[PDB]
């Protein structure tokens, strides 16, 4: 019987997590929920799952929630603010914390769950993109157990030995028999587009949410998954490669010393890796029909060409350059993408802008959230500057 | 290493034995050969003894053993030489040996294999007949001494690697269901006649498909793997499926309760599963070229056509009928295949011969190697008669 705190409960990952709980009531108890300002949805979740605690992002939201709950005679205690969220992430009786507050704003609560020794289900990506060293050092310090919920990281996790799975990101891949992690992805809608057509890609062509569309066409999404993966799995540059797999049947793979490659497959569904993570080392049922091998297309593979995906190369370079570089790249990219979606720059200008920012860098390695914030803001400025000027 | 693993290799001069030595040769600080067992191949045994200096070697008879000792003497070896079944069984059970490569083929391989298991060893299983013929006996003995079994064959190895750790550690006597396992997926290529029109089957010559070739041409190989797989993994009929995968990049896979699948992939290099099994639970390098994903083509999947592959269905039937039936099936098939190879019967006869023998016998479930052997002879003989018609 697991006690849960869910950080970022009203969003998509929040609801999927709650969905698993709803299907497995004897396995999972919700102790605490933390959300932003969506009072209507948070009330509905508190009324269904009876948490002991709830926290909103601000006092005004908390007060409206307190009213809604009190009308139903609920027992739930309501708080607000970042400190409250951190406290709920560290409660004694809690076994499992879903860290799904998005953006850099998600760092402090994530880090509080990690600092409390909890099983942490990692749904926040900036933690590792921007201050991986601080996060993974805190992991080793507290022995916290990380479990990735995004499909690729979750497939690498399942393709690894228990020994590494239970010592996530602070055990040696090599000593434990791992030769290299194989991070896979589809290559986006432009995997076969003639290179000459890239300069003409429009927002509507990349877009048929919107920013994630663009990140998956540039492979920035894969680049970010790459950097988080070097931190999550304690891998060097030589211990990871990226392979294209158009059909998205394999989710990712792991090569071992003797030649063996273990791979995880399954029909694409958000809930599956969440449910794997939450139930681990048990398994519980899915909604979706099991993958049928007579109905998958043939499975194919390639190597990503840097001419076609220069952002990928850029994210690797940024990775090897350090955390200030990846913080900056991440921030720069957000600006680039909106600028593209706002028809201000060409599709092909994204890498250029991003590279300019990354290579213009000369700041120290960040060692806290505060220093990450500084770099993030500087990088948005320079990126915006670099945009305006062409 | 101060935790070197000591090895007994049974059937040291076969191809599995030599590949096992290759992994030793690549990791000389991790593995030490303590004993080698072979049959009649005196020259080969000697080259291996002179390379790895085992404490002991056995041959299958005294003529073999005496001449081996002569060459070992000429070259100044400290290897003590023995012969006979008893010797092999003792070599399989030395106190200081951690693991036994059980690679003696045929029913001849059962005594030594059983001796390793009973000594609670890490047993690297490379003898089909052990589980096809007396599964119940071998598995009861595994549970009873807690021996750790490690499938060496491609597909069984792939399945082992794709299963939860808790299953791996209690291999053969743990619950698939309780560990989130839903289904074992046994894959195979379909062999050379996967796409031959059925009406040409009757005309297939021994060439177009060596017992080995034929076995995978009929997919008797896979049905055999299927029976062994039921014992090895403690799977019911409903917990195992067969899938055709022509390119054989995926070596086999496991479905879990959440619908997710784990597969092991690699290249055809037999050192992969051997090094896996030998290093277990650690891993080692052994010179294997990492699968290159630019060079694999499209991977494709399909269900086996029992019309094209009747043997498979027969193997499943035999399995459901019990150990006498599967023992009979194994034996019938040897006689059957040789009869196809010797230009005495249609390719297309092999199954009917096999099913006829399997279906014509009044047997009792064997409960010892000896009774296994009795069903084997009986069944070989019946097969001989069926052929005369
Ligand atoms: Mg992803
Ligand atoms: Mg020793
Ligand atoms: Mg095989």
Task: Identify the bridge partners of residue B32 per DSSP, sorted by sequence position.
Answer: B6
Q: What is the DSSP string of A87-117?
A: HHTT-TT--EEEE---SGGGHHHHHHHHHTT
Distance CA A30, CA B385 (A): 71
Q: Strand, coil or helix: what is A147? A: strand
Q: Strand, coil or helix: what is B164? A: coil
List Cβ neighbours of A240 (8 Å cut-off, separation of 6 or more).
Answer: A180, A181, A182, A183, A226, A229, A230, A233
Radius of gyration (C-alpha) of chain B in whole angstroms: 21
CATH class of A306-390: mainly alpha
Name the residue in chain A with its Cα closest to that of B268: A259
For residue A285, how many other CB atoms are within 10 A of its CB?
14
Binding-site residues of A for NADPH: 10-13, 36-38, 124, 126, 209
- Domain extent listing, chain A: 1-150, 151-305, 306-390
Distance CA A50, CA A4 (A): 12
Distances (CA, A) of B128 to B115, B124, B125, B231: 16, 12, 8, 11
Counting runs of H as helices and runs of E as strands, what totals does chain B give?
15, 11
Distance CA B237, CA B244 (A): 18
Q: Resolution in Å, one decimal, please.
A: 2.2
> Ligand 3 centroid vs B220 CA: distance in angstroms?
11
From A304's Cα to the closest Cα of chain B, the distance in A is 11
| Nearest CA among A286, A279, A228, A283 for reference residue A96 | A279
B154 assigned ligand-binding residue: yes
Sheet holding A28-34: strands in order across? Answer: A77-80, A53-56, A28-34, A2-7, A96-99, A119-122, A145-148
Query: How many contacts (CB atoms, under 8 Å) link A and B?
Result: 133
> Ligand 2 centroid vs A126 CA: distance in angstroms?
49
Distance CA B373, CA B377 (A): 6
Distances (CA, A) of B288 to A257, A260, A295, B16, B285: 9, 10, 33, 15, 7
The minimal CB distance from B161 to the residues A243, A260, A290 is found for A260
CA neighbours within 13 Å on the CB side: how many for B215? 17
Q: Fill in the DSSP letter of residue A143.
A: T
From A283's Cα to the closest Cα of chain B, the distance in A is 5
| Nearest CA among A258, A285, A271, A244 for reference residue A161 | A258
Distance CA A34, CA A76 (A): 12
For residue B349, how many other CB atoms are within 10 A of its CB?
17
Phi-psi region of A149 (alpha: psi -120 to 50; beta: other; left: phi over 0): alpha
- Residues of B within 8 A of A258 (CB-CB) are 271-272, 275-276, 279, 283-286, 288
- Residues of B within 8 A of A264 (CB-CB) are 260-262
- Which residue spans within B239-291 are E strands per DSSP? 240-244, 250-256, 261-265
For residue A143, how many other CB atoms are within 10 A of its CB?
10
Distances (CA, A) of A40 to A35, A60, A66, A67, A99: 11, 13, 12, 11, 21
According to CATH, the topology of domain A1-150 is Rossmann fold (3.40.50)
Distance CA B183, CA A331 (A): 45
Same fold, B1-153 and B306-389: no
Residue A32: φ, ψ to 5°:
-145, 135
Phi-psi region of A85 (alpha: psi -120 to 50; beta: other; left: phi over 0): alpha
Task: Identify the bridge partners of residue B183 per DSSP, sorted by sequence position.
Answer: B255
Distance CA B377, CA A120 (A): 61
According to CATH, the topology of domain B306-389 is Rna Polymerase Sigma Factor; Chain: A (1.10.1740)
Burial of A342 (0-12, 13-18, 19+ CB in 10 A): exposed
According to CATH, the topology of domain B1-153 is Rossmann fold (3.40.50)
Q: Strand, coil or helix: what is A315? A: helix
Phi-psi region of B180 (alpha: psi -120 to 50; beta: other; left: phi over 0): left
> Ligand 1 centroid vs A184 CA: distance in angstroms?
9
Q: Do B282 and A158 touch (CB under 8 A)?
A: no
Task: Identify the bridge partners of residue A265 per DSSP, sorted by sequence position.
Answer: A250, B261
Q: Do B258 and A301 touch (CB under 8 A)?
A: no
Strands A240-244 and A250-256: unpaired
Radius of gyration (C-alpha) of chain A in whole angstroms: 21
Burial of A115 (0-12, 13-18, 19+ CB in 10 A): middle
Helix (H) or strand (E) holding B292: none
- Residues of A within 8 A of B259 (CB-CB) are 266-267, 272, 285-286, 288-291
From B59's Cα to the closest Cα of chain A, the distance in A is 31
Distance CA B372, CA A279 (A): 45
- Buried b / exposed e over A200-219, threshold 16 CB at 10 Å, is ebebeebeeeebebbbbbbb
| Nearest CA among A182, A299, A118, A323 for reference residue B300 | A299
Could you tell me what percentage of chain A is helix, strand and coil, using 3-state DSSP and rounding each to the nearest 5?
A: 50, 15, 35
Test the A interface: residue of B168, B249, B252, B260 with most A CBs within 10 Å: B260
The minimal CB distance from B255 to the residues A178, A290, A294 is found for A290
Sign, Cα dihedral of B168, B173, B179, B183: positive
Distance CA B287, CA B270 (A): 11
Distances (CA, A) of A348 to A187, A198, A282, A341: 16, 6, 46, 12
Task: Identify the bridge partners of residue A29 per DSSP, sorted by sequence position.
Answer: A3
- Residues of A within 8 A of B302 (CB-CB) are 293-294
Q: What is the DSSP string of B327-386?
A: HHHHHHHHHHHHHHHTTSS-TTHHHHHHHHHHHT---PPP-SHHHHHHHHHHHHHHHHHH
Give the number of the ligand closest to the Cα of residue B226: 3
Distance CA A310, CA B315 (A): 54
Helix (H) or strand (E) holding B82: strand B80-83
Q: Do the Cβ atoms of B345 and B387 come closer than 8 Å?
A: yes
> Ligand 1 centroid vs A228 CA: distance in angstroms?
11
Q: Do the Cβ atoms of B142 and B158 come closer than 8 Å?
A: no
Sign, Cα dihedral of A209, A213, A215, A219: positive
Distance CA B212, CA B354 (A): 16
| Nearest CA among A89, A78, A35, A90 for reference residue A57 | A35
CA neighbours within 13 Å on the CB side: how many for A235? 29
> Any idea what the Cα angle at residue B171 is, between residues B170 and B172, rounded to 5°?
110
Could you tell me what percentage of chain B is helix, strand and coil, using 3-state DSSP and rounding each to the nearest 5?
A: 50, 15, 35
Q: Do B282 and A162 touch (CB under 8 A)?
A: no
Name the residue in chain B with its Cα closest to that of A304: B294
- As residues whose CB is below 5 A from the ion ligand 2, the structure lists B 6, 96
Long-range contacts of the stretch B339-346 (C-beta < 8 A, 24+):
B339/B387, B340/B206, B340/B214, B341/B206, B341/B210, B341/B211, B341/B214, B343/B206, B344/B387, B345/B387, B346/B202, B346/B204
| Nearest CA among A29, A36, A37, A42 for reference residue A74 | A42
Distance CA A321, CA A318 (A): 5
Distances (CA, A) of B165 to A162, A264, B168: 7, 16, 5
Binding-site residues of A for 1-deoxy-D-xylulose 5-phosphate: 125, 151-152, 186, 216, 221-222, 225
Test the B interface: residue of A162, A293, A295, A296 with most B CBs within 10 Å: A293
Distance CA A359, CA A348 (A): 17
Q: What is the DSSP string of A227-272?
A: HHHHHHTT--GGGEEEEE-TT--EEEEEEETTS-EEEEE----THH
Residue B62: φ, ψ to 5°:
-80, -25
- Residues of A within 8 A of B291 (CB-CB) are 259, 261
Q: Do the Cβ atoms of A323 and A371 come closer than 8 Å?
A: no
For residue B385, how many other CB atoms are within 10 A of its CB?
11
Q: What is the DSSP string of A320-382?
A: HH-HHHHHHHHHHHHHHHHHHHTTSS-TTHHHHHHHHHHHT--PPPP-SHHHHHHHHHHHHHH
- Which residue spans within A137-234 are E strands per DSSP? 145-148, 178-185
- Residues of A within 8 A of B256 (CB-CB) are 283
Q: Do A291 and B261 touch (CB under 8 A)?
A: yes
Sheet holding B31-37: strands in order across? Answer: B80-83, B56-59, B31-37, B5-10, B99-102, B122-125, B148-151
CA neighbours within 13 Å on the CB side: how many for B234? 21
- Buried b / exposed e over B244-260, threshold 16 CB at 10 Å, is bbbebbbbbbbbbbbbb
- Which residue spans within B201-260 are E strands per DSSP? 240-244, 250-256
Q: Strand, coil or helix: what is B170? A: coil
Q: Do B293 and A272 touch (CB under 8 A)?
A: no
> Any idea what the Cα angle at residue A175 is, between residues A169 and A176, rounded to 5°?
70
């Amino acid at each position: 019987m697991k006690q849960l705190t869910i950080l970022g409960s009203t969003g998509s990952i929040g609801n999927s997590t709650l969905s698993v709980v709803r299907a497995n009531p004897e396995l999972f108890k919700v102790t605490a929920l933390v959300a932003g300002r969506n009072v209507r949805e948070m009330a509905q979740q508190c009324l269904e799952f009876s948490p002991r605690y709830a926290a909103m992002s601000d006092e005004h939201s908390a007060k409206s929630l307190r009213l809604l709950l009190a009308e139903q005679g609920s027992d739930t205690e309501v708080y607000s603010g970042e400190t409250a969220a951190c406290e709920l992430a560290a409660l004694d009786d809690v076994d499992q914390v879903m860290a799904a507050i998005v953006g850099i704003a998600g760092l402090p609560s994530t880090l509080a769950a990690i600092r409390a020794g909890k099983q942490v289900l990692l749904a926040n990506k900036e933690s590792l993109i921007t201050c991986g060293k601080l996060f993974m050092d805190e992991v080793k310090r507290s022995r916290a157990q990380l479990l990735p919920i995004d499909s690729e990281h979750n497939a690498i996790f399942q393709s690894l030995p228990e020994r590494i799975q239970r010592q996530l990101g602070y055990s040696s891949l090599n000593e434990n028999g791992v030769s290299r992690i194989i991070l896979t992805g589809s290559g986006g809608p432009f995997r076969e587009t003639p290179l000459s057509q890239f300069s003409d890609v429009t927002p509507d062509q990349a877009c048929a949410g919107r920013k994630i569309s663009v990140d998956s066409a540039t492979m920035m999404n894969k680049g970010l998954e790459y950097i988080e993966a070097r931190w999550l799995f304690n891998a060097s540059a030589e211990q990871i490669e990226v392979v294209l797999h158009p059909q998205s049947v394999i989710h990712s793979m792991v090569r071992y010393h003797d030649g063996s490659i273990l791979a995880q497959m399954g029909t694409p569904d958000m809930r599956t890796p969440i449910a794997h993570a939450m139930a681990y080392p048990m398994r519980v049922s899915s909604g979706v029909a099991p993958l049928d091998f007579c109905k998958v297309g043939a499975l194919t593979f390639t190597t990503p060409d840097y001419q076609r995906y220069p952002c990928l190369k850029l994210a690797i370079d940024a990775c090897n350059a350090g955390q200030a570089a990846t913080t900056a790249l991440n921030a720069a990219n957000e600006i680039s993408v909106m600028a593209f979606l706002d028809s201000k720059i060409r599709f092909t200008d994204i890498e250029v802008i991003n590279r300019t920012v990354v290579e213009g860098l000369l700041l120290s390695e960040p060692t806290s959230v505060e220093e990450v914030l500084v770099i993030d803001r500087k990088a948005r400025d320079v990126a915006a500057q670099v945009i305006a000027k062409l």
